[PDB]
Amino acid sequence: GAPGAPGSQGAPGLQGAPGAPGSQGAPGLQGAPGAPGSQGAPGLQGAP
Amino acid sequence: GAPGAPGSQGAPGLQGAPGAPGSQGAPGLQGAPGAPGSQGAPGLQGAPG
C-alpha cells in the first residue's frame, strides 16, 4: 500500500435554480391621458 | 534424523486491496436544478382608457 490517494470531488457548483423567466415582458404601463375635448364650432357667430 | 515440519505459510487467497474511496459512503451529489416562481403576477391594471 502507499499511493492510495483518490483526489476526486463530488459535483460542486451546481446549485442554482435554472429557469429564470429571463425577461417576461410585463403587465403594461399606465398610458398617459389626453385632454378629452373635441373639435367643433367655437365660433363667436351664434344663432342666426 | 527426524527433521520436523513447521508447516509453510503463504498467501491466504484474498489479495484484493479494498481501497477504492467509495466505502459505501454515498459520494457527491449531482447538479442542483431549479426553476422560476410567481414572477410578476400583476393584479389590477391601470386601464386609463
Coordinates of N, CA, C and O in Angstrom, one line a residue, chain A residues 17-47:
Chain A
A17 N -31.2 27.7 -9.2 CA -32.5 27.3 -9.8 C -32.6 27.8 -11.2 O -33.0 28.9 -11.5
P18 N -32.1 27.0 -12.2 CA -32.3 27.4 -13.6 C -33.8 27.7 -13.9 O -34.6 27.5 -13.0
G19 N -34.1 28.2 -15.1 CA -35.4 28.6 -15.4 C -35.9 29.9 -15.0 O -37.1 30.2 -14.7
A20 N -34.9 30.9 -14.9 CA -35.3 32.3 -14.7 C -36.2 32.7 -15.9 O -35.9 32.3 -17.0
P21 N -37.3 33.4 -15.6 CA -38.1 33.9 -16.8 C -37.2 34.6 -17.8 O -37.7 34.8 -19.0
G22 N -36.0 34.9 -17.5 CA -35.1 35.5 -18.5 C -35.7 36.7 -19.2 O -35.6 36.9 -20.4
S23 N -36.5 37.5 -18.5 CA -37.3 38.6 -19.0 C -38.6 38.0 -19.5 O -38.6 37.0 -20.2
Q24 N -39.7 38.6 -19.1 CA -41.1 38.0 -19.3 C -42.0 39.2 -19.7 O -43.2 39.2 -19.3
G25 N -41.5 40.1 -20.4 CA -42.4 41.3 -20.8 C -42.8 42.0 -19.6 O -41.9 42.4 -18.7
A26 N -44.1 42.3 -19.5 CA -44.6 43.0 -18.3 C -46.1 43.2 -18.3 O -46.7 43.0 -19.4
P27 N -46.7 43.5 -17.2 CA -48.2 43.7 -17.2 C -48.5 44.9 -18.1 O -49.6 44.9 -18.7
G28 N -47.7 45.9 -18.2 CA -48.0 47.0 -19.1 C -48.2 48.3 -18.3 O -48.9 48.4 -17.3
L29 N -47.5 49.4 -18.8 CA -47.5 50.7 -18.1 C -48.9 51.3 -18.3 O -49.7 50.9 -19.1
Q30 N -49.2 52.2 -17.4 CA -50.4 53.0 -17.4 C -50.2 54.2 -18.4 O -49.3 55.1 -18.2
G31 N -50.9 54.2 -19.5 CA -50.7 55.2 -20.5 C -51.1 56.6 -20.0 O -52.0 56.7 -19.2
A32 N -50.3 57.6 -20.5 CA -50.7 58.9 -20.2 C -52.0 59.3 -20.8 O -52.3 58.9 -22.0
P33 N -52.8 60.1 -20.2 CA -54.1 60.5 -20.8 C -53.9 61.7 -21.8 O -52.8 62.2 -22.1
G34 N -55.1 62.2 -22.3 CA -55.1 63.4 -23.1 C -56.3 64.2 -22.9 O -57.3 63.6 -22.4
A35 N -56.3 65.4 -23.2 CA -57.4 66.3 -23.0 C -58.6 65.8 -23.8 O -58.6 66.0 -25.1
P36 N -59.7 65.3 -23.2 CA -60.8 64.8 -23.9 C -61.8 65.9 -24.4 O -63.0 65.7 -24.2
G37 N -61.3 66.9 -25.0 CA -62.1 67.9 -25.6 C -62.6 67.4 -26.9 O -62.8 66.2 -27.1
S38 N -62.7 68.3 -27.9 CA -63.0 67.8 -29.3 C -63.0 69.1 -30.2 O -63.2 70.2 -29.7
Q39 N -62.8 68.8 -31.5 CA -63.0 69.8 -32.5 C -64.5 70.1 -32.6 O -65.4 69.3 -32.4
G40 N -64.8 71.4 -33.0 CA -66.2 71.8 -33.2 C -66.4 73.2 -33.8 O -65.6 73.6 -34.7
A41 N -67.3 73.9 -33.3 CA -67.7 75.2 -33.8 C -67.7 76.2 -32.7 O -68.8 76.7 -32.3
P42 N -66.6 76.5 -32.1 CA -66.5 77.5 -31.0 C -66.4 78.9 -31.6 O -65.6 79.7 -31.2
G43 N -67.3 79.2 -32.6 CA -67.3 80.5 -33.2 C -68.2 81.5 -32.5 O -69.2 81.2 -32.0
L44 N -67.7 82.7 -32.5 CA -68.5 83.8 -31.9 C -69.9 83.9 -32.6 O -70.8 84.3 -31.9
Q45 N -70.0 83.6 -33.9 CA -71.3 83.5 -34.5 C -72.2 82.5 -33.8 O -71.8 81.4 -33.6
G46 N -73.4 82.9 -33.5 CA -74.3 82.1 -32.8 C -75.6 81.8 -33.6 O -75.5 81.5 -34.7
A47 N -76.7 81.9 -32.9 CA -78.0 81.6 -33.6 C -78.3 82.7 -34.6 O -78.3 83.9 -34.3

